[PDB]
Amino acid sequence: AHKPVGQNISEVRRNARLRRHARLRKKVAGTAEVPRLVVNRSARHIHVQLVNDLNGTTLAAASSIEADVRAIDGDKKAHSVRVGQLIAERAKAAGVETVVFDRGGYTYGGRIAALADAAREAGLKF
Amino acid sequence: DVRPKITLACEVCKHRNYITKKNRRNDPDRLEIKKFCPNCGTHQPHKES
Amino acid sequence: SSSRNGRDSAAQRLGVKRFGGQVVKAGEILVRQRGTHFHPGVNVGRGGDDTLFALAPGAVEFGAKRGRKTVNIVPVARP
Amino acid sequence: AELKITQVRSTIGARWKQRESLRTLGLKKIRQSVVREDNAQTRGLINTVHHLVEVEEVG
Amino acid sequence: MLIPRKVKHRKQHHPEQRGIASGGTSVSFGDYGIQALEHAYITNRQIESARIAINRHIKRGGKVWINIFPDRPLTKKPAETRMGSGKGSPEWWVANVKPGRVLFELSYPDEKTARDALTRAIHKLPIKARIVTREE
Amino acid sequence: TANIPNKLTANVRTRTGKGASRQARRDGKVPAVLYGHGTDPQHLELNARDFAAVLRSHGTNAILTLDIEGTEQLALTKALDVHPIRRNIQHADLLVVQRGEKVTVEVTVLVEGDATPGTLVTQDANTIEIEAEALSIPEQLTVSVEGVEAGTQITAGQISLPEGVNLISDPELLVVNVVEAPSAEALEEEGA
RNA sequence: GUUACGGCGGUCCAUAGCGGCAGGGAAACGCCCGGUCCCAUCCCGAACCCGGAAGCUAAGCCUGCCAGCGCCGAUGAUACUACCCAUCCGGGUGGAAAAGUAGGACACCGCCGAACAC
RNA sequence: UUGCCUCCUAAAAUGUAACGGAGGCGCCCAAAGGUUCCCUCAACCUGGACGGCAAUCAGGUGUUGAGUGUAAGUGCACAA
RNA sequence: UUUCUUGCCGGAGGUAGAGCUACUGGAUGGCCGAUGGGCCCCACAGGGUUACUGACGUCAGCCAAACUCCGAAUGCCGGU
Ligand SMILES: [Mg+2]
Ligand SMILES: [Mg+2]
Ligand SMILES: [Mg+2]
Ligand SMILES: [Mg+2]
Ligand SMILES: [Mg+2]
Ligand SMILES: [Mg+2]
Ligand SMILES: [Mg+2]
Ligand SMILES: [Mg+2]
Ligand SMILES: [Mg+2]
Ligand SMILES: [Mg+2]
Ligand SMILES: [Mg+2]
Ligand SMILES: [Mg+2]
Ligand SMILES: [Mg+2]
Ligand SMILES: [Mg+2]
Ligand SMILES: [Mg+2]
Ligand SMILES: [Mg+2]
Ligand SMILES: [Mg+2]
Ligand SMILES: [Zn+2]
Numbered sequence: 001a002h003k004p005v006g007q008n009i010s011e012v013r014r015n016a017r018l019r020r021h022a023r024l025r026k027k028v029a030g031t032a033e034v035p036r037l038v039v040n041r042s043a044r045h046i047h048v049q050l051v052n053d054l055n056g057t058t059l060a061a062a063s064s065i066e067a068d069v070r071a072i073d074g075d076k077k078a079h080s081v082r083v084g085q086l087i088a089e090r091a092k093a094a095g096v097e098t099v100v101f102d103r104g105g106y107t108y109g110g111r112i113a114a115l116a117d118a119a120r121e122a123g124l125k126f
Numbered sequence: 127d128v129r130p131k132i133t134l135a136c137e138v139c140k141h142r143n144y145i146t147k148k149n150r151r152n153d154p155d156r157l158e159i160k161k162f163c164p165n166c167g168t169h170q171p172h173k174e175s
Numbered sequence: 176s177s178s179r180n181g182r183d184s185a186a187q188r189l190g191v192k193r194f195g196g197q198v199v200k201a202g203e204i205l206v207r208q209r210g211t212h213f214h215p216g217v218n219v220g221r222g223g224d225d226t227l228f229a230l231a232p233g234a235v236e237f238g239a240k241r242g243r244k245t246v247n248i249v250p251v252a253r254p
Numbered sequence: 255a256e257l258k259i260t261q262v263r264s265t266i267g268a269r270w271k272q273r274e275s276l277r278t279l280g281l282k283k284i285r286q287s288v289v290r291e292d293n294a295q296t297r298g299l300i301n302t303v304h305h306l307v308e309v310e311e312v313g
Numbered sequence: 314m315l316i317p318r319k320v321k322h323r324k325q326h327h328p329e330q331r332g333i334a335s336g337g338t339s340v341s342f343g344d345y346g347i348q349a350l351e352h353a354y355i356t357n358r359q360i361e362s363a364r365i366a367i368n369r370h371i372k373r374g375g376k377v378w379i380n381i382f383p384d385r386p387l388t389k390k391p392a393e394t395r396m397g398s399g400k401g402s403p404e405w406w407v408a409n410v411k412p413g414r415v416l417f418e419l420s421y422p423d424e425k426t427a428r429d430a431l432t433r434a435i436h437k438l439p440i441k442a443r444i445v446t447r448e449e
Numbered sequence: 450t451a452n453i454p455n456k457l458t459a460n461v462r463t464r465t466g467k468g469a470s471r472q473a474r475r476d477g478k479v480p481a482v483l484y485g486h487g488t489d490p491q492h493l494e495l496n497a498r499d500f501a502a503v504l505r506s507h508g509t510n511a512i513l514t515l516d517i518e519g520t521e522q523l524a525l526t527k528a529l530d531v532h533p534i535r536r537n538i539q540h541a542d543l544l545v546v547q548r549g550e551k552v553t554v555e556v557t558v559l560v561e562g563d564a565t566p567g568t569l570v571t572q573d574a575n576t577i578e579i580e581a582e583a584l585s586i587p588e589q590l591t592v593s594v595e596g597v598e599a600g601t602q603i604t605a606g607q608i609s610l611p612e613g614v615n616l617i618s619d620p621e622l623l624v625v626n627v628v629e630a631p632s633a634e635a636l637e638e639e640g641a
Numbered sequence: 642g643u644u645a646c647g648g649c650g651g652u653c654c655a656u657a658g659c660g661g662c663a664g665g666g667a668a669a670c671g672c673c674c675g676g677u678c679c680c681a682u683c684c685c686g687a688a689c690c691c692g693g694a695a696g697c698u699a700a701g702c703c704u705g706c707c708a709g710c711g712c713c714g715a716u717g718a719u720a721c722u723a724c725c726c727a728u729c730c731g732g733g734u735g736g737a738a739a740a741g742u743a744g745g746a747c748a749c750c751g752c753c754g755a756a757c758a759c
Numbered sequence: 760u761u762g763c764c765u766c767c768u769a770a771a772a773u774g775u776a777a778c779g780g781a782g783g784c785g786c787c788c789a790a791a792g793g794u795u796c797c798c799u800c801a802a803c804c805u806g807g808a809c810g811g812c813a814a815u816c817a818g819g820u821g822u823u824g825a826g827u828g829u830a831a832g833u834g835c836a837c838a839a
Numbered sequence: 840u841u842u843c844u845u846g847c848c849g850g851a852g853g854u855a856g857a858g859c860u861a862c863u864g865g866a867u868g869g870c871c872g873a874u875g876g877g878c879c880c881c882a883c884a885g886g887g888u889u890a891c892u893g894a895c896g897u898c899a900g901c902c903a904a905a906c907u908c909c910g911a912a913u914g915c916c917g918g919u
Contacts, residue, residue, distance in 0.1 A: 004700055006819070009687080010672050011701045016688090020797080022837065040648060042670065044694090049649060049753060056650040058753035065647095065669075065755065075692065077679090107796090109680060110690055129787080146789095153789060176391075177760080178399030178778060184764045189833090190772060194916045195850030206851090210834025213851090225834085235917090237850065239653035241837085244851095271844070272724095278844045298845045301735080305725050315640075321864050324780060326768080326904055335720070335740095335857075338533040341575075341900045342868055350534070364640050374569060374630040379640050382866050384902070397778050409902085413533035418868095420571060447575065449509070449531075462717095468733070470718070482717040484743050490716045528742065530718060540718040542742065573869055573899075602870080622898070623870065640867090 021105030028102050029053050035096055037087070037119070037126070039104045039112060046080050046111055048087045050096065060090040080111040084118025091124060098125045134172040136163040142175060193235045198251060203229045205246050216240065216247035256312040257296060260287040263306040275302040314357040316406055317384045324400050328354065328385050328409035340447045342378040343418035345427050351440040354407035355416070357383040363434035367419060370430035375421040381408040410440065450611050451584050454514035454523060455503045461518065462492040470540075479538050483515065483524055485545030493517065493543075501538065504529075508588040510554050513543070525552060525583060546583040553617055554579055554586050558608065558624055562595030567630050570594050574624045577605050580615040587611060592625060599629035 030036025035050040045064040052059060064070070064079045068086070072078050091099065106112050120126065134144040134157070141163065148157055156174040163170040189207045193199050206213050206227040215221045216238065218231040229235075233248040261281040265273050279299050280288045289312070290296045300309055330352035340346040360379060367377050383406040390401035410416065417434055421427040428444055435442045462469065462480065470480045478494040493515070503511050509529060515522045523546055530540040546552060555576045564570050577590070592608050606620030631639070 002699070008672070008700045010670095013688085014671085014701060016798090019837090023797095026837065036649090038649060040670095042647095043673090045669080047648065047754080051649055051752085053650070056751060058649070061648090061753055063648095063754070075678095077691085107680085107689060113679090148789065149787085157789070159789080176398055176778095178780085180399075180780060180782090181760065181778070182764095182782085183766090186774065188773065191851045191916080192773095193850095194772090195918095196848090197850085197917050208834090209832070210839090212833065235850080237653090241652095241654055243837090244653085269724095274844045276844095294846045296845080300845095302724080302845075304734080315866095317865055319865080320903095322767095322780080322903085322905070326780085328903090332720080332856085333533060337901055339900085342571075342573075344572075361641075365637075368633075368636045371636070373633045373636060375636070376569065376571065376631060376868090377636070377640060378868060378900090380867065380900070382902080384865055400779065415900090420569065422569075449504070465717075466735095467719080467737090468735095471732090480718070482743095484716065486743080488744080490743085492717065532719095542717075544743075571869080575899095621870090626869065 017105040019105075024102065024105060028100055030100060030102075034098050034100055035059055035091075036102045037099045037124075038102045039106070039115065041104065041106050041111060046076075046083055046115060048083060048115065050087070050091055050094070050099065059094045059096065060087060062086040062090060077111055077114045080115040081118040084115040085122050087115075088119045088122035088124045097123070101126050132157065133175040134159070134161060135175045136161075136166060137171040137173055139163065139165045139170075141165050143172060148174075195235055195237055197235050199229045199232065199235060199248070201229050201232050205229060205235060212244070213237075214240070214243045214245045216245035218248035219246050255292045257290050257292050257300075258287055258310045258312055259290060259300065260285060260308045260310075261306060262308045265306070268306065272303050272306065275299045276306065279303070279307075281307070314361055314406075315379070315383055316357060317382070320384065320386065323386060323403055324388055325386055327387070328407070330354075330409065330411070332411060334411035334413035337380055337415055338413040340415055340418055340445060341380075343376065343420040344447055345421070345424075345431060346380075346415045346418040346445050347431050347435060347438075347442045348445040349410050349414045349416055349440055349442050350412050351442075352412065353410050353438075353440045354385070354387065354405075355381065355383065355410045355438065355440075357406045359438055360408075363417065363437040366433040366437055367417065367430045370433050371419075371421055371426060375419060375427075375430075378418040379416070380418060381410065381414070381416050383408045385409055415445065416442070450587060450613075452507070452512055452586065452588075454512050455507060456514050456516065457495055457499055457503065459493040459495055459515045459517050462494055465492055474537070474539070479541060481541035481543055483517075483522070483543045483545060487545060491517065495541065497538065500541065504538075508557065510556065510586050510588070512546070512583060512586070515543070523547065523583070525554075525586075548583055550583045551580055552583055552586070554581060556587060557589050559589050559591045560594055560625060561591050562593040564594050564627060565596065565598050568597075568599055569628055569630045571626045571628060572624070573626055574605070574622055577608070577616070577622070577624065578618040579610070580617050582613050585611065585613045587614065594625060594627060597627050599627055601627045603627075 028036060030051050030053045032052050032054065035052050038049045038051055040047040047061070047063040047065070049061045050059040051057070062083050064083055066086075069079050069082045072082050074081075101116055103112055108116075116126075128151070129147045129149050131145055131147055133142045134146065135142045143163055143165075144161055158171060158173050160169050161172045162168070163172070187207070189209065191206050191213075193203065193205045199205065204226055205219065208225050208227070210225060211221075213227055215227055216236075218229065218233065220228050220230050222228060227246050229248050231248055231250070233250045236247040236249045238245050238247055259279055259281065261276065261284050264284060265276060268276075276282075279290065279296075292311070300307065334349070338348075360381070360383065364377060364379060385407050386403040387405040387407055388401035389404035416438070417431065419427055419431060421430070431444050459481070462473075473480055473494050474497070477497045479497045479500055481493045481495055483491040483493055503513065504526070509526060511526050513524050513526065515524050524543040525546050526541065527544040528542040529538055531537070532539055544552070555578050558572070558574060558577055560570060560572055579586075581587070590608055590610070592603055594603070597603070602623055603625035604620060605616060605618050605622040605624050608616075608624065610616060
């Protein structure tokens with residue numbers, strides 16, 4: 001008859017991320033001309049989407065789930081670098097050069113910064 | 127009186143560029159802050175005259 | 176005897192200045208208010224005194240977003 | 255259909271909207287009569303001045 | 314006398330004597346009650362007078378509810394004063410009574426004595442009133 | 450227990466609104482709505498004398514068979530609007546019911562019996578909420594206080610219900626409170 | 642294309658919530674293992690961050706089912722009301738609540754990505 | 760009593776009188792300003808050396824009843 | 840003809856009314872029982888009882904210019 005008494009850490013973490021993602025979104029919005037680059041970061045993987053918030057539509061996406069990234073031999077930062085390059089290539093094919101980076105409610109640094117820097121290096125303007 | 131009017135002058139050219147107020151009991155020392163100086167055309171240290 | 180009252184301040188002429196469907200120029204004041212009874216929406220700015228004003232020309236549109244009442248500017252079609 | 259509208263009462267003491275609705279119907283004197291089409295616009299004018307006019311239906 | 318312990322606003326506009334009572338129009342505690350048929354300000358002194366009249370008639374073995382509390386202040390200026398110089402000081406406490414409002418309720422075993430007691434109270438009130446029962 | 454429907458003639462209203470309703474009442478008819486699980490509101494007029502007589506005989510929750518354009522419909526008196534001053538019925542809400550349907554109804558609790566001589570019986574609930582069959586609704590429930598002494602508190606759970614009748618009001622509701630009769634001293638303090 | 646799937650959005654933002662009962666782990670989401678490295682604690686690798694994959698669906702998350710508490714809610718009637726009749730009260734035409742009732746409801750819609758099918 | 764600010768009167772745009780009903784101001788802050796990032800009160804329940812209704816600690820319930828330098832009102836938990 | 844009038848369409852509102860377990864205050868009667876108070880065991884401790892007192896909670900009936908979960912009719916702004 002086990003009944004948990006409080007909130008598990010995963011519950012607290014999930015809703016706190018959502019909270020501070022919403023906080024960031026008060027100022028960061030995407031358009032067809034300048035899409036929002038949204039990042040989701042798990043322990044295992046990292047995902048990015050280009051979103052136009054006027055339509056609520058995703059223009060391009062990339063993730064560490066792809067076999068091309070799973071083959072990378074480095075650490076999680078190395079996979080983040082690959083995802084950064086893939087999203088820049090797919091966005092430039094979609095006709096986009098300027099984006100606004102949405103850190104998704106995570107601290108800017110580590111894997112997030114490595115993806116953003118790889119995207120900048122491959123010529124996304126942000 | 128308690129909050130007297132003070133004039134901030136540029137440390138470089140000494141033009142009296144700004145006027146503001148401070149509590150002289152909370153800040154007995156002469157106020158020193160960086161402000162844009164028109165004559166110099168750049169931010170410079172300014173000090174209470 | 177005498178009253179301790181007899182005091183009041185000037186009327187501040189607050190309120191909605193441009194109602195639904197009115198065409199406005201950019202910069203035009205839409206509402207005068209004390210707090211955010213109305214929130215800025217699309218192409219509406221909020222002044223330091225919480226005045227709402229147009230950031231682009233168009234028609235004034237009132238709407239609700241997450242319960243907050245909002246003022247919006249919708250672009251008018253060019254002739 | 256048509257409505258014959260005859261002014262029965264004076265405009266003295268009548269409010270602005272009443273006086274102007276009579277002008278809009280084309281009535282300017284007691285016992286004058288106008289012929290108007292029975293549409294929504296005409297009904298609204300009559301409703302404003304119903305105490306000042308007599309309405310008869312034609313056709 | 315019934316007086317409120319405190320009021321947020323001690324000088325108030327007169328209560329408006331318009332409209333039929335929308336609330337408190339039925340007997341809810343006793344078996345008999347007094348229903349108002351007219352608008353009045355009923356003062357705490359009238360309520361006291363009426364309640365004591367009911368008590369004296371039944372002597373004992375009954376319960377009287379007062380459905381109305383005089384929490385509305387009416388002011389008065391000092392005597393022989395000219396108009397102006399501020400609003401007067403509070404002097405009377407009244408209940409804003411509307412037709413249909415049940416003012417008093419009584420429970421008593423004997424109908425004849427109950428009705429007589431309520432009649433004694435009605436003669437103390439500034440208004441016209443009738444006796445009403447819980448029944449339809 | 451089984452109640453027979455009382456017949457009332459009803460006609461569909463030609464016009465609705467306060468003007469039409471006031472005229473109907475002036476001509477001695479009461480406006481009513483009939484609405485149902487079938488979700489099909491009908492606007493009716495009833496004769497004021499006949500409807501009032503039914504309510505006098507069988508109480509507020511009378512079961513009626515309405516005759517609407519020759520079609521008989523079973524209905525229950527759901528609610529009554531009674532003018533606070535004139536005591537006339539302004540309007541009636543009638544609920545369509547089929548036989549054997551459970552209906553939640555509020556019934557009148559009557560008090561019967563000689564309390565012990567130094568006692569006053571105070572009734573705190575005029576009414577209790579009940580589930581019953583459309584035709585089994587008791588027009589009045591009686592509680593006996595014939596013997597109870599001061600301090601006793603008849604609650605809703607202690608009242609006899611016929612077969613089929615279920616209690617929806619929670620059992621803790623006081624229906625009757627029996628108290629020792631107030632002295633003249635207590636009358637003088639009460640309400641001072 | 643179909644899924645007890647993962648994200649990002651939307652709704653004049655609860656008909657979507659709170660709660661109860663049962664169930665789910667393919668890839669994902671998660672707890673989880675561990676501080677050598679960027680980084681971190683007004684103390685604490687709890688959190689934030691980084692490096693991992695031994696364990697587990699017990700929680701979060703997700704799916705099905707309950708109207709218990711919240712929430713939405715008519716029709717009709719009334720209150721109120723604009724204008725007009727009306728020597729005192731009232732009435733007519735038009736508009737029309739709040740509360741309550743019947744009842745609704747354990748959300749719905751868009752884009753992208755998984756995994757599997759073709 | 761005389762200028763300024765807030766509320767009610769004021770009749771659901773604005774404005775609206777009286778020696779009508781209530782209060783406040785003639786400042787304060789070098790951060791209590793700018794920006795970036797993070798966080799969520801009050802109250803209540805339970806446990807704990809001094810320690811009590813209430814100090815600091817721990818768990819739970821809690822969507823806003825706390826807090827916004829300073830009157831009041833309009834706002835602000837997305838936080839202001 | 841930009842004015843006005845009438846029909847229709849787009850708007851903001853907090854009055855009338857109403858409601859309050861939706862807030863801030865006022866407030867009637869039940870029920871329940873912290874809290875003091877009396878008394879019996881008698882130690883001042885732990886407890887058992889009383890024509891006292893009644894928080895908090897709950898059931899039902901209510902009230903407000905400066906109460907509002909609600910909320911018209913008119914009026915007002917614009918378009919046609
Ligand atoms: Mg300092
Ligand atoms: Mg003002
Ligand atoms: Mg500012
Ligand atoms: Mg400023
Ligand atoms: Mg005249
Ligand atoms: Mg009421
Ligand atoms: Mg798996
Ligand atoms: Mg750890
Ligand atoms: Mg489980
Ligand atoms: Mg309706
Ligand atoms: Mg309603
Ligand atoms: Mg105004
Ligand atoms: Mg007005
Ligand atoms: Mg004037
Ligand atoms: Mg509105
Ligand atoms: Mg009122
Ligand atoms: Mg009000
Ligand atoms: Zn200089």
